[PDB]
Design an enzyme around this catalytic site. Structure first.
Site, PDB file in Angstrom:
ATOM      1  N   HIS A 167       0.838  -1.194   0.000  1.00 41.02           N
ATOM      2  CA  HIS A 167       0.000   0.000   0.000  1.00 41.02           C
ATOM      3  C   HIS A 167       0.875   1.247   0.000  1.00 41.02           C
ATOM      4  O   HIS A 167       1.892   1.296   0.704  1.00 41.02           O
ATOM      5  CB  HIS A 167      -0.910   0.008   1.252  1.00 41.02           C
ATOM      6  CG  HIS A 167      -1.796   1.210   1.379  1.00 41.02           C
ATOM      7  ND1 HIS A 167      -2.896   1.410   0.573  1.00 41.02           N
ATOM      8  CD2 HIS A 167      -1.801   2.222   2.283  1.00 41.02           C
ATOM      9  CE1 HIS A 167      -3.509   2.527   0.937  1.00 41.02           C
ATOM     10  NE2 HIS A 167      -2.868   3.037   1.975  1.00 41.02           N
TER      11      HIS A 167
HETATM   12  C1  LIG Z   1       5.588   9.485   6.615  1.00 43.38           C
HETATM   13  C2  LIG Z   1       5.038   8.076   6.638  1.00 43.38           C
HETATM   14  C3  LIG Z   1       4.856   7.323   5.490  1.00 43.38           C
HETATM   15  C4  LIG Z   1       4.331   6.008   5.503  1.00 43.38           C
HETATM   16  N1  LIG Z   1       4.174   5.296   4.338  1.00 43.38           N
HETATM   17  C5  LIG Z   1       3.680   4.086   4.392  1.00 43.38           C
HETATM   18  C6  LIG Z   1       3.470   3.318   3.140  1.00 43.38           C
HETATM   19  O1  LIG Z   1       3.713   3.773   2.030  1.00 43.38           O
HETATM   20  N2  LIG Z   1       2.960   2.057   3.331  1.00 43.38           N
HETATM   21  C7  LIG Z   1       2.634   1.460   4.559  1.00 43.38           C
HETATM   22  O2  LIG Z   1       2.157   0.317   4.553  1.00 43.38           O
HETATM   23  N3  LIG Z   1       2.861   2.171   5.683  1.00 43.38           N
HETATM   24  C8  LIG Z   1       3.321   3.406   5.619  1.00 43.38           C
HETATM   25  N4  LIG Z   1       3.500   4.117   6.770  1.00 43.38           N
HETATM   26  C9  LIG Z   1       3.171   3.442   8.051  1.00 43.38           C
HETATM   27  C10 LIG Z   1       1.691   3.467   8.410  1.00 43.38           C
HETATM   28  O3  LIG Z   1       1.340   4.834   8.422  1.00 43.38           O
HETATM   29  C11 LIG Z   1       1.481   2.802   9.774  1.00 43.38           C
HETATM   30  O4  LIG Z   1       2.092   1.519   9.740  1.00 43.38           O
HETATM   31  C12 LIG Z   1      -0.009   2.579  10.078  1.00 43.38           C
HETATM   32  O5  LIG Z   1      -0.725   3.808   9.924  1.00 43.38           O
HETATM   33  C13 LIG Z   1      -0.172   2.044  11.486  1.00 43.38           C
HETATM   34  O6  LIG Z   1      -1.571   1.842  11.706  1.00 43.38           O
HETATM   35  P1  LIG Z   1      -2.124   1.706  13.227  1.00 43.38           P
HETATM   36  O7  LIG Z   1      -3.531   1.214  13.118  1.00 43.38           O
HETATM   37  O8  LIG Z   1      -1.077   1.018  14.034  1.00 43.38           O
HETATM   38  O9  LIG Z   1      -2.071   3.248  13.749  1.00 43.38           O
HETATM   39  P2  LIG Z   1      -2.398   4.647  12.991  1.00 43.38           P
HETATM   40  O10 LIG Z   1      -2.879   4.454  11.602  1.00 43.38           O
HETATM   41  O11 LIG Z   1      -1.219   5.488  13.297  1.00 43.38           O
HETATM   42  O12 LIG Z   1      -3.610   5.174  13.937  1.00 43.38           O
HETATM   43  C14 LIG Z   1      -3.419   5.542  15.295  1.00 43.38           C
HETATM   44  C15 LIG Z   1      -4.414   6.638  15.651  1.00 43.38           C
HETATM   45  O13 LIG Z   1      -4.512   6.736  17.089  1.00 43.38           O
HETATM   46  C16 LIG Z   1      -4.761   8.086  17.431  1.00 43.38           C
HETATM   47  N5  LIG Z   1      -4.410   8.166  18.826  1.00 43.38           N
HETATM   48  C17 LIG Z   1      -3.162   8.093  19.397  1.00 43.38           C
HETATM   49  N6  LIG Z   1      -3.191   8.133  20.701  1.00 43.38           N
HETATM   50  C18 LIG Z   1      -4.530   8.236  21.003  1.00 43.38           C
HETATM   51  C19 LIG Z   1      -5.236   8.288  22.215  1.00 43.38           C
HETATM   52  N7  LIG Z   1      -4.611   8.258  23.400  1.00 43.38           N
HETATM   53  N8  LIG Z   1      -6.582   8.384  22.168  1.00 43.38           N
HETATM   54  C20 LIG Z   1      -7.175   8.386  20.983  1.00 43.38           C
HETATM   55  N9  LIG Z   1      -6.620   8.318  19.778  1.00 43.38           N
HETATM   56  C21 LIG Z   1      -5.296   8.252  19.850  1.00 43.38           C
HETATM   57  C22 LIG Z   1      -3.966   8.886  16.411  1.00 43.38           C
HETATM   58  O14 LIG Z   1      -4.465  10.191  16.261  1.00 43.38           O
HETATM   59  C23 LIG Z   1      -4.072   8.040  15.121  1.00 43.38           C
HETATM   60  O15 LIG Z   1      -5.134   8.428  14.251  1.00 43.38           O
HETATM   61  C24 LIG Z   1       4.000   5.416   6.753  1.00 43.38           C
HETATM   62  C25 LIG Z   1       4.199   6.185   7.918  1.00 43.38           C
HETATM   63  C26 LIG Z   1       4.710   7.466   7.888  1.00 43.38           C
HETATM   64  C27 LIG Z   1       4.891   8.218   9.179  1.00 43.38           C
END
Ligand SMILES: Cc1cc2nc3c(=O)[nH]c(=O)nc-3n(C[C@H](O)[C@H](O)[C@H](O)COP(=O)(O)OP(=O)(O)OC[C@H]3O[C@@H](n4cnc5c(N)ncnc54)[C@H](O)[C@@H]3O)c2cc1C
Ligand SMILES: Cc1cc2nc3c(=O)[nH]c(=O)nc-3n(C[C@H](O)[C@H](O)[C@H](O)COP(=O)(O)OP(=O)(O)OC[C@H]3O[C@@H](n4cnc5c(N)ncnc54)[C@H](O)[C@@H]3O)c2cc1C
Ligand SMILES: CC(=O)N1C[C@H]2CC[C@@H]1c1ccccc12
Ligand SMILES: [Br-]
Ligand SMILES: [Br-]
Ligand SMILES: [Br-]
Ligand SMILES: [Br-]
Lengths: 487, 489
Positions: free
Chosen positions: A460
């Site tokens: 992705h």
């Molecule tokens: C610059 C960049 C580029 C990237 N490019 C890619 C790519 O091309 N492909 C890929 O596969 N991955 C990519 N990633 C990685 C991907 O973004 C993460 O792996 C993924 O979003 C993780 O998903 P998650 O469900 O763990 O958390 P996230 O999607 O980070 O969601 C966590 C959420 O929790 C919220 N939150 C945090 N603490 C609290 C709280 N205490 N109470 C309520 N809400 C809270 C935040 O606001 C956030 O919306 C990239 C990351 C970055 C930083």
């Protein structure tokens, strides 16, 4: 006179694979015949074959060039600014770059022959004198001067195909793809005749390089172009070609062509319609190239459609004479010809018979935008299987909402045997589709099921991850009849 | 005002948390609440409804890399005959950022409407933390003394708060930014240092290189010898060369020691070696750390790993029976599709009585460098430690189109790594245009235990880069009990 284990008539995709493999893998004495040492007029194909000289290789370079028409326009949505009124497409520069790339390939094959033991090249026209004698003459005329007489234990027919030209008044004022590769100027108005991939690919090429005020028209005698491809994709590519300024004339067929006083062509269709164009390119089919081979001298059997008849191991009815590639009038693709050539030599000169698998062959159309496909379309699957499911995803990618080309829907379809989930076909339309499809061809050799795709983790963001996000069929075929839900 | 009760409360409305919450409500009829801190992208909290990928991650960065690619397309078009006024070309960064903002906001709004519409799937705005094993508190800020907006009763609790940029403790770190801020710069920097050797530093170096104003310069520094640790070593070296060839300066074995402001307000960086560099922006991209601090996990005793992620078993369970964790908070593979897979598997297991665990091996992934990387499975030096005999099949050449475009430095690299004892493909590594699209179906192949003969027996699609994967039959070299050698002994 000269003695050989194998004589190959045609130094093309299949013939060179066979000849090189026989010589280097099995230490055989090989001779290969072709009519020209490098590309272009008067014989167009040459050492290296149709793909190298007037086929896949140069057309792909020219499609890449035509894609810049879209890239220059689409850059603006991402903030790129420049003087749009200064843009011009230099066709002469394109053709010269293409000519230099092809000639480089011609020369490298020349050195391959000079550098390889037991692998000899002969210039001229080959034909069958007797079961074990190949003659090489100065011209296609069977009465021209003999240049070589080649004794052969085994003979391989690998002369390819040639453009089919309809028997209509004025056909002599039309060209084929052969001549299109060498046009001194890009045509301002052009008609491409046919619904197949060559007609579609050249429509896109001419569309990008046409001078100001130009117009490309494609005509096809039936209702929908690209017969044999996925129907959803046939409809969509029609829509997307039209969105880029190409006029698609379906249910129309030229009845005659005549010369105008200014040198342009006046086309009259069977319907009575007329169209004036600068160039009429016929791309209605390609037929096996058998007439110069004097197959009657030895009795090689042809099929009713004109191919050399072969069994699954590329053997004709005459012992020790084989045929591979487009001359067998089956799948006309370069990698299939190569595969056939290698299987042939492994069988004859090695101790392991091998036959080419003509199912589940991945292929592409370098339309703008392009197609990638492997395996069965749904309506063919529905006649072989009682229950067929179709999974479909079709949307404009986010980047083309920004680029402004909102018409560029990406289409991904998976066709399954619904009784056990086995993937029967995968069909793609959109940027990257030919590259996405290659490893799908490998999947189909591992008896992949729809669940094998959906349980794989996506990469992705890509277009390809759509193939791993489809769980629920969009519709079905039961006993051959299309329906939205199962009974 | 009364608390509300749910089968499942999800803290973090991101890649993993939204998959888990949507599936629990729509597939299994459960009552679900999801908590996030902001309803659309950007400052002050950057991530928001939709998660890091949607708001300040994969989605916007891919749009920005696509924009940067036009610098190459415009130049490369001349080899194919395209003529235009080169002196008139300008890259308008403000238009790129505005187009990206409108796209992300459209996604934000669609997620907001999903919650407003869907029975049993509710959204709460604020900061979630654990009060007890079955109560999630939502507060106005990350400070646990801030005001309580809601108390959500929960039979099951999912921690899915993601990760956050790491900032090194050096003097002057307040003059530096992270990727979060990079997404909102008002103007493109004339001179920028990206600090780090990983994918975020490399990708942003490419973006800044395309949009820099006349006479600008992008520098990337990395503290060790070769960028992109963890990727194929041939590809690491080639990416380095091709970034250099497009005008990016790569400073390896270098690391900032301090940053100060010059009298004109630009940043003066001093490296540990004593070298200096003046730039307009310093972007730190040295790592991302799991977001556990604000959850108050001590209230319930959820164990963290030494590294700092939430400890989980193969089914995403913490040491507290009804509390789970998925995604970046577990500090493993930080990819959006892995978090999504973990969330779907968790919900199938807990609510669908169809147990399933995520396979963290043979995951396909990409780097949207220019040109890009696509990879799946093991790199050869890792394979050589686990298998007695390893074979490497390798093709590397400049494709014909880039001999005409003029970008002759753009070698395409395709490598297949095998267990030579039985032919099983252990990894596939690609560098070049299209590589992220090519690698997706390779992931399916490895899930099906493909061998090298399955690749070679497949007929190529011609002309493509991908067909190189189906025309390799003889190893380029081997590893035999860890030892690299051209031939088997
Ligand atoms: C610059 C960049 C580029 C990237 N490019 C890619 C790519 O091309 N492909 C890929 O596969 N991955 C990519 N990633 C990685 C991907 O973004 C993460 O792996 C993924 O979003 C993780 O998903 P998650 O469900 O763990 O958390 P996230 O999607 O980070 O969601 C966590 C959420 O929790 C919220 N939150 C945090 N603490 C609290 C709280 N205490 N109470 C309520 N809400 C809270 C935040 O606001 C956030 O919306 C990239 C990351 C970055 C930083
Ligand atoms: C415009 C165009 C685009 C194409 N694009 C693609 C594509 O993208 N992908 C793809 O897979 N396929 C493509 N093809 C098809 C591909 O070119 C053929 O399938 C392939 O070249 C056939 O291989 P072959 O070995 O049968 O013969 P060829 O490659 O045709 O070689 C036959 C050779 O025989 C020589 N010859 C003929 N008669 C004699 C004689 N009597 N004596 C001596 N020599 C003789 C000819 O000069 C020629 O060099 C394209 C074809 C065309 C026309
Ligand atoms: C945590 C983070 O990503 N930051 C990036 C940048 C701006 C806010 C914060 C920060 C703290 C200290 C110095 C520099 C910064
Ligand atoms: Br027709
Ligand atoms: Br039709
Ligand atoms: Br700007
Ligand atoms: Br093999």
């Amino acid at each position: 006179s000269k003695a050989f284990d194998l004589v190959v008539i045609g130094a093309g995709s299949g013939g060179l694979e066979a000849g090189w493999n026989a010589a280097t893998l099995y230490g055989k004495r090989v001779a290969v015949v072709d009519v020209q040492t490098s590309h272009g007029p008067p014989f167009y194909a040459a050492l290296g074959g149709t793909c190298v000289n007037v086929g896949c290789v140069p057309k792909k370079l020219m499609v890449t060039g035509a894609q810049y028409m879209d890239h220059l326009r689409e850059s603006a949505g991402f903030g790129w600014e420049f003087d749009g009124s200064s843009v011009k497409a230099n066709w002469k520069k394109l053709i010269a770059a293409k000519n230099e790339a092809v000639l480089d390939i011609n020369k490298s094959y020349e050195g391959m022959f000079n550098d390889t033991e037991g692998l000899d090249f002969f210039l001229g026209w080959g034909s069958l004198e007797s079961k074990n004698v190949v003659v090489v003459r100065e011209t296609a005329d069977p009465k021209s001067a003999v240049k070589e007489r080649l004794q052969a234990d085994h003979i391989l027919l690998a002369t390819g195909s040639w453009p089919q030209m309809p028997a209509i008044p004025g056909i002599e004022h039309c060209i084929s793809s052969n001549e299109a590769f060498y046009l001194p100027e890009p045509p301002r108005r052009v008609l491409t005749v046919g619904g197949g991939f060559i007609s579609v690919e050249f429509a896109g090429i001419f569309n990008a390089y046409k001078p100001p005020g130009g117009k490309v028209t494609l005509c096809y005698r039936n209702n929908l172009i690209l017969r044999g491809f996925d129907e959803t994709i046939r409809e969509e590519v029609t829509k997307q070609l039209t969105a880029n300024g190409i006029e698609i004339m379906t249910n129309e067929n030229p009845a005659k062509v005549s010369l105008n006083t200014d040198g342009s062509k006046h086309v009259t269709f069977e319907s009575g319609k007329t169209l004036d164009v600068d160039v009429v390119m016929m791309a209605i089919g390609r037929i096996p190239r058998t007439n110069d081979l004097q197959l009657g001298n030895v009795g090689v059997k042809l099929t009713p459609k004109g191919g050399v008849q072969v069994d699954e191991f590329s053997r004709t009815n005459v012992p020790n004479i084989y045929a591979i590639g487009d001359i067998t009038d089956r799948l006309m693709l370069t990698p299939v010809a190569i595969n056939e050539g290698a299987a042939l030599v492994d069988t004859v000169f090695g101790n392991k018979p091998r036959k080419t698998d003509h199912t589940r062959v991945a292929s592409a159309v370098f339309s703008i935008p392009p197609i990638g496909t492997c395996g069965l379309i749904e309506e063919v699957a529905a006649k072989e299987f009682e229950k067929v499911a179709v999974y479909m995803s079709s949307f404009t990618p986010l980047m083309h909402n920004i680029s402004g080309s909102k018409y560029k829907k990406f289409v991904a379809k998976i066709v399954t045997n619904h009784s056990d989930g086995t993937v029967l076909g995968v069909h793609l339309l959109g940027d990257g589709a030919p590259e996405i499809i290659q490893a799908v061809g490998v999947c189909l050799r591992l008896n992949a099921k729809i669940s094998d795709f959906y349980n794989t983790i996506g990469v992705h963001p890509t277009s390809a991850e759509e193939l791993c996000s489809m769980r629920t069929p969009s519709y079905y075929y039961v006993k051959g009849e299309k329906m939205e839900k199962l009974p």
